[PDB]
Amino acid sequence: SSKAASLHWTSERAVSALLLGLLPAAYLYPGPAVDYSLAAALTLHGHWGLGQVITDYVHGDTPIKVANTGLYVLSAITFTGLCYFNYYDVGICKAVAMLWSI
Amino acid sequence: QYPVVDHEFDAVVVGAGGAGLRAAFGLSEAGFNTACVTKLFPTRSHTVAAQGGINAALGNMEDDNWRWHFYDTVKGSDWLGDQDAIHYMTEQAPAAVIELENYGMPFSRTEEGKIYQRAFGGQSLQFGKGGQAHRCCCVADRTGHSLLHTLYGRSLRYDTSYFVEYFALDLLMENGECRGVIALCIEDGTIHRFRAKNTVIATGGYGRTYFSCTSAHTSTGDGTAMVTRAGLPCQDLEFVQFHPTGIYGAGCLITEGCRGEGGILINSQGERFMERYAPVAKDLASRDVVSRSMTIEIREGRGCGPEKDHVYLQLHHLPPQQLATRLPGISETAMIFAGVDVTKEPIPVLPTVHYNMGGIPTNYKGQVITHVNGEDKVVPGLYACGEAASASVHGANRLGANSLLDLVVFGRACALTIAETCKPGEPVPSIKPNAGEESVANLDKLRFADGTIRTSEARLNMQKTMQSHAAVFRTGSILQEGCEKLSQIYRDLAHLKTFDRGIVWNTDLVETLELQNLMLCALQTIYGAEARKESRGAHAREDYKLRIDEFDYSKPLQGQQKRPFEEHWRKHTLSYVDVKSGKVTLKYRPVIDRTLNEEDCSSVPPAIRSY
Amino acid sequence: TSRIKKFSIYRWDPDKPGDKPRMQTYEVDLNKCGPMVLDALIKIKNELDSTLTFRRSCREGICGSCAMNIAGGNTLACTKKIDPDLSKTTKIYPLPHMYVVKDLVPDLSNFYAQYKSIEPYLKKKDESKQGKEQYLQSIEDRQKLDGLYECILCACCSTSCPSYWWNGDKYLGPAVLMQAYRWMIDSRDDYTEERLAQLQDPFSLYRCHTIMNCTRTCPKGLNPGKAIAEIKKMMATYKE
Amino acid sequence: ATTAKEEMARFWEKNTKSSRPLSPHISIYKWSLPMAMSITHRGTGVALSLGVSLFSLAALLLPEQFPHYVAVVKSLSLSPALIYSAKFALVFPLSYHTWNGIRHLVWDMGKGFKLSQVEQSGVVVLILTLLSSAAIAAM
């Protein structure tokens, strides 16, 4: 895509607006729908945001590839663990509410 | 002791103001391998500070005619202007400004979408009989800023080889021909010799010879000084323009466009006193008349401020939207440097050194000329344009908004003359193995100078001597008192004192070189002023109040005894300097009265000059 | 009734082998000096230390020569009032995160080259009638250039941007970017899509993260940050 | 007659092999609340992501499920103020980053760029962050 850089910038904002609306959804309609949407949005937003950090601060062909590769492993493991928590445990919404009942 | 790097081009341009840029990429546009040598990054040149605009008979406001603009310029020049150069400049002006707009210059606009033009000092319709003209095209009051940034932008499309922050020391002369220049690279401290079949000198003015001036710090007349060191003459250097409204204190320029938009000058008693000095044009008279009018008011007790030493420029009667649209630049400047809110209080202003009518003599093609036994002789390979040159389109007094036009017309003209006279890739002329070694010896002596008067102390004594002895009004006893003082300062240059012994970015050294340049320019100014026993344009002698032409042009020419060329003063001053002694030599040459085509543009004989 | 002000100024001499950057202090009687910092630099150079090196010319805030870091911020020394509080020393540095040629003079050639890279000149598809007639532009379309064309290329904004600090080799910076926008929205230019397409990479435009140091520091009161945001909106909506 | 790309390469080629120093920057530049609030937006973003990643790692590696570790904490009978203090510390970063994130998305529409509006919206973000975190931690 010749418009790839601007398409990524627009996608970053689209996911941010979506994550913003998941917060009232998580308070209003807690359940599996929101649990897995939060897992997907939390990872994609975090993955892209941590990539901007890498783009800003890491320099040199090899350090850049090492950083982005480790980020990709971190994000893939993060999304998997969140889906695990949603399927095998109480899920994101319930955990928050339990944590706050302490 | 110094490394020398030798270059070879078809042509070399010295200067990156409006005129140098137009010439430099003009030459590359025509296939020439061109070098542009400049001691500043191009957009730092004084052109960037220009405000009011650029004249052209476009007819965007009312029906105009470039010949009406021709007449105004000849009359404004007090018949010291060369009418063939004025013809070329004023006829080419519509195409020159249209070129700039097509380059992208962000001109202000009229309801019809065309270039906005404002009234400006001493410009009329119908050959002087038809009222005020509106032909000064402008980008608000930031015209020079936009012109210089547009030309620099345009220059980036061509193969010109720029040499930025390079300081030209001297021309490379051989058998009366110019084969290039020798320059100092300020960044790494190296000496560079540029060899070229043609050199174009576009080094700006030398307003900094005075204590107070609107000019930038870098306006030190470097190219005027190389010509003088080459043994060539400079022309009409005694005609220094005093702009009416330089801000009081800092000397920053407040544009004549203020009066073009409706601003008026007021003395300590609230009189629009230009109604008495110029009943017709009032605050839009020629600058030499306005500056004299303001100066007369001040020494007669009607000055403003606590010291009674300036006057006021009032704008608050105009709507604030006009002041914001037409004059936003000087609205900010007046606040920053004088604490003035232009919608409520007047600006403190006083006549201030601003522009040099004199300079390197050329013909209308841009070619530098010398004078031998009554004939002009083109200097092979040497050109000049802009404020450094004397075409002469401005004669004894320049009309506002004609300088920026001068820049692009004669910058282009230098490029056109070289292209029709020479071809690219023609042999680059050889130079002597040690050509320019004198320039290096002088720079090294200044680099290690250890006398008793630092450069700053000598620059001041020059600027105060010029300010006291060659101001708006001049007399013989004051001019001669300043000639001996200035020639004494020049002899005292032998005891100069520097401190910076480095060579990379040694502004101590460079400014010492600029002081030498300024001094050569100042001596020629004050010595040519002392000998000119008349009053013409900006040059006002109170011991010679009349204009002395070859006839008495007030009374009918019928049966008049014509004054010989040595008994009148309608003639240019030519100045030379023996650099070692400082001795100034003066000669004269006739004013060119013919146009380029008398059937297309009638020659204007001298007449009485009033506004 | 002298008022002695203290200035502390960065010094480095490239002609002295082994020379290390230091901070030299000068004392200036404000009663015998102009109101602006540049007047103090010039008075210091004329009378106290002729080796102090810096760029200057117009002394009225229009040419851009004298940009530097004064009292912590990037400004023009000639439009910056001297702080008359004699209980505080004014610290003067070169433009930040730049190679120092000497004393207060930075190397701007990368900043100039980045400006060249965006082709800052009017471009039309048909330039065969260049120089024949003035192009038309309504007062309204010309107003859109206000706030943009006045830039004096002083480099105060770009050298105040942390993104230009870390990625100045590939991030164009707010001065150059705002000039790109000044040509994108000139109604007379025909290469708008081409100028947007130039910025389709992770660095040229998209290293800007809306820190807004650039707008705070601009001595001409311009807003390069808003210009960048207007570019980004154009990048996201133009169709090829 | 050098191209811009060529000029860039010559700049880097000659400066990195030079003896020229680099002008100071972080140690000398004057701070501002917009700059501090931009640094804090990145710190809170990075901290939230690292927290999200540590949570998901704990879910894949801890030998006990979430309700166990909640019952453990409840049986320590910690003080109300320390529970409040822990709840404030967890929600403050999310609160700051959320409100300042809305500020960023307002900027991305091109609104609020007047420098005086940047300062207003920042102070508004600060008081909304503090009001939301005290309200939520008290829950």
Ligand SMILES: *Cc1cc2c(cc1C)nc1c(=O)[nH]c(=O)nc-1n2C[C@H](O)[C@H](O)[C@H](O)COP(=O)(O)OP(=O)(O)OC[C@H]1O[C@@H](n2cnc3c(N)ncnc32)[C@H](O)[C@@H]1O
């Ligand atoms: C001072 C001024 C003049 C002015 C004006 C406002 C001000 C404050 N407004 C004007 C206006 O509204 N309309 C108009 O027609 N004229 C106006 N003027 C006058 C006009 O601007 C100037 O006379 C004109 O711009 C001069 O331009 P030019 O191209 O001739 O020269 P420059 O712009 O001053 O630049 C000089 C260049 O020469 C190079 N140089 C000088 N010495 C050296 C050495 N030794 N080696 C290498 N290069 C050198 C400089 O780098 C500079 O680029």
Ligand SMILES: CCCCCCCCCCCO[C@@H]1O[C@H](CO)[C@@H](O[C@H]2O[C@H](CO)[C@@H](O)[C@H](O)[C@H]2O)[C@H](O)[C@H]1O
């Ligand atoms: C956990 C919380 C995280 C965020 C907390 C941040 C705390 C650090 C803030 C440091 C602020 O530092 C201070 O900021 C203020 C406001 O912008 C600056 O103020 C300056 O800019 C403003 C804005 O144009 C001017 O109105 C004001 O007159 C001027 O002094 C000041 O120069 C700086 O000294």
Ligand SMILES: N#C/C(C(=O)c1ccccc1Cl)=C1\NC(c2ccccc2)=CS1
């Ligand atoms: N904002 C900012 C900033 C960043 O990295 C930064 C933050 C958020 C997003 C992107 C970036 Cl790139 C930095 N600012 C400074 C700093 C320190 C002292 C004085 C002046 C500036 C060092 S890093």
Ligand SMILES: CCCCCCCCO[C@@H]1O[C@H](CO)[C@@H](O)[C@H](O)[C@H]1O
């Ligand atoms: C939010 C986490 C930020 C981590 C920053 C770690 C320190 C970065 O390290 C620095 O990065 C700079 C470019 O950014 C380089 O100019 C420096 O040479 C390098 O040392």
Ligand SMILES: O=C([O-])CC(=O)C(=O)O
């Ligand atoms: O000198 C000129 O040509 C015009 C000028 O300074 C002004 O704008 O007042």
Ligand code: SF4
């Ligand atoms: S935007 Fe402002 S600070 Fe930046 S270069 Fe232009 S004038 Fe200078």
Ligand code: F3S
């Ligand atoms: S300071 Fe820098 S990050 Fe963007 S808003 Fe200005 S260019």
Ligand code: FES
């Ligand atoms: S000297 Fe021209 S901007 Fe300061």
Ligand SMILES: [K+]
């Ligand atoms: K001249």
